[PDB]
Amino acid sequence: YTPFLANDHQHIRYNPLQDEWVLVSAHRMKRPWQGQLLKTVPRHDPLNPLCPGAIRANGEVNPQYDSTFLFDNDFPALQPDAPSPGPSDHPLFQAKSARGVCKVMCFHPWSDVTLPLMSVPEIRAVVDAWASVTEELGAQYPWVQIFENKGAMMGCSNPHPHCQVWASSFLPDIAQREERSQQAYKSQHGEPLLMEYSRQELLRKERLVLTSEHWLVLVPFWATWPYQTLLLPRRHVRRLPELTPAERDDLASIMKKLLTKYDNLFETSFPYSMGWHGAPTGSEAGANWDHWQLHAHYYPPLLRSATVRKFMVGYEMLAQAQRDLTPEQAAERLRALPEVHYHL
Amino acid sequence: YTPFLANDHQHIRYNPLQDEWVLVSAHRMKRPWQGQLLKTVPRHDPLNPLCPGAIRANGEVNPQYDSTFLFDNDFPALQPDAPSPGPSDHPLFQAKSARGVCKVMCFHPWSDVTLPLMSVPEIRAVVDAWASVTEELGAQYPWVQIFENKGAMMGCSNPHPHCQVWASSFLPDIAQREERSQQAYKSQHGEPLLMEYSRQELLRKERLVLTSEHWLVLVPFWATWPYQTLLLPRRHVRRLPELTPAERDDLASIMKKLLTKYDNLFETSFPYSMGWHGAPTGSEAGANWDHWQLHAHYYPPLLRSATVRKFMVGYEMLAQAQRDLTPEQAAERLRALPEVHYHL
Ligand SMILES: *P(=O)(O)OC[C@H]1O[C@@H](N2CCC(=O)NC2=O)[C@H](O)[C@@H]1O
Ligand SMILES: *P(=O)(O)OC[C@H]1O[C@@H](N2CCC(=O)NC2=O)[C@H](O)[C@@H]1O
Ligand SMILES: [Zn+2]
Ligand SMILES: [Zn+2]
């Protein structure tokens, strides 16, 4: 193999998983006309409705929980209402009925911890809870979407460590795109798309970030956010509950290392959105889904410092995604960072 | 016809132009844990490289221009380099060579004006310049993308009134999606997609914002940003240079009214990204493009006030777009706003 060189002022790269192209402008500079107060988080606040013992907006009191805690969102985007007909059927005005369940999942009872500061056993409890909620809601819904939205820069105003889980009657757009691409690849090549992608990136080396006995982390060839990563198991695994105890402990360990590297990059608590994608569940869960491979995406906004971010606007809203930093530059910088968390 | 009622806690709506679905959660509330210095802009600053008479980063001096001014971006995402082979051809590592031209276009020589504060003749000069650059760059490139990125909230640090123009050797992803959908609709129905959409929204009324002799503005059925609009001509028109003098004056007038309504909504200078989509140009410009209809999109982030915005993150990055405010609520509020600009 040969490295992918930065020998042009612009080229385009393909995302085969979601079927889109990215414009890459290597070595492009910036000369902005003008440039672009963190109060300490108490360990317990009785007025924070994610804390043990606190009152929520529906009037219920949280228990004195030990590790994770799951509850129904009091302001939910989806609710388990009775089936009903589709409210509109004209070619240009198409609408369908929908239903679902939205949960909040606290990671830990203390508000002043984040995942990279938690111990490996504390993170294993999070992994076990992710598997449990996927089993439970997947019995009734074809798509269960676990996601974490971390930091004020992502619009998250409550600093307590947590994620959300939205299960839906419909397969969302991105899940449909990943179903189509993975199915077509397996029919043509006889192997799952992301198993072959893992094999090739291990041989090419230059986009790897971390490797462990059971997992790897890399910056995808087609990444759109500056320090975006992809996390996936080395074994062929369709859904999160299939992970063995050893695979779950190793996932907790490699997540701790990745998220500590992310905090060390600009010596700040690193914001992002992330989530998990696995084979659809629901009434067709027993069908053939061998084309699927479980994986997680991380989409972080920071670009050059704790204050200098990427804005996905303008040409990226009217035409297609664009980046300056190459994926090979990003991965090189991430590999070099220590796994010991910085201290002020 | 009958209004589209807000009678459920959730449903999904289809975008037939870009082929995607949106989750709509009518009447959903928010209870955030915590909540979410504008210096005066001088009319002329010799150190602002968009002003008449100022020195730019390449050392050249801007002329004393009268209305619009066009120049090559000194930090360009695309450059007109010599054709070259594609740097990679494996199924999972696909890349193609690319080339193009990036311009900056100042709207006016004074830095302390924005479009809604400009006169109708001043805005007509902008329309004429948009037509001219589309003709000129479309002779060599199949896609010319005009876009305006307005406001610090969109990452624009230079407050001088301006847009950008990026012409590319490739057809970008969104243009390919709109080519596919418009072509399929015309083959099946015998009329252009957006001409039929205009006809139906004029009959249904409830998503209209402004109507004039030659144009209309509406909130699309499938809109994703809170006060998103679509602007298009009433006549079937494939590309911007085809607009007649009367159509160009009327475009200047209706843009002034829309952007003044937008500023009046939260009594602030309203941020957004916008741009124009028309039939592809370049070497195939003479082929049959009757399925196309010229149009512009506006994508603004503000939701409830000058400080409270929508974040397209989390579930929207991992699954699909989601909104609380309905398109019918948004359009109703926009219709009621005065066309006289507010004053502090
Ligand atoms: P993260 O910030 O991603 O999610 C926290 C969620 O908690 C919901 N809340 C807040 C307050 C309350 O009393 N009940 C509740 O469910 C909030 O809407 C966020 O989605
Ligand atoms: P808007 O803020 O959308 O675009 C302004 C563009 O101007 C470019 N500049 C800035 C300074 C300079 O000396 N030359 C130049 O081309 C800047 O990169 C923005 O894209
Ligand atoms: Zn995925
Ligand atoms: Zn369009």
Curated annotation (Swiss-Prot), chains A, B:
The active site is at H162. Pathway: Carbohydrate metabolism; galactose metabolism. Changing R309W: In GALAC1; no enzymatic activity. Its cofactor is Zn(2+). Keywords: Carbohydrate metabolism, Cataract, Disease variant, Galactose metabolism, Metal-binding, Nucleotidyltransferase, Transferase, Zinc. It comes from Homo sapiens (Human). Disulfide bonds: none annotated. InterPro entries: GalP_UDPtransf1 (IPR001937), GalP_UDPtransf1_His-AS (IPR019779), GalP_Utransf_C (IPR005850), GalP_Utransf_N (IPR005849), HIT-like_sf (IPR036265). Binds 2 zinc ions per subunit. This is Galactose-1-phosphate uridylyltransferase. Changing E267V: In GALAC1; 2-fold decrease in activity. Belongs to the galactose-1-phosphate uridylyltransferase type 1 family. It is linked to Galactosemia 1: A form of galactosemia, an inborn error of galactose metabolism typically manifesting in the neonatal period, after ingestion of galactose, with jaundice, hepatosplenomegaly, hepatocellular insufficiency, food intolerance, hypoglycemia, renal tubular dysfunction, muscle hypotonia, sepsis and cataract. GALAC1 inheritance is autosomal recessive. Changing I146T: In GALAC1; loss of activity. Zn(2+) 1 binds at C51, H160. Changing L171P: In GALAC1; no enzymatic activity. Its EC number is 2.7.7.12. The keyword Metal-binding applies. UDP-alpha-D-glucose binds at A57, N73, D74, N149, Q164, K310, F311, M312, V313, Y315, E316. Homodimer. The gene is GALT. Changing L303P: In GALAC1; results in no detectable protein in the soluble fraction. GO terms for cellular component: cytoplasm; cytosol; Golgi apparatus.
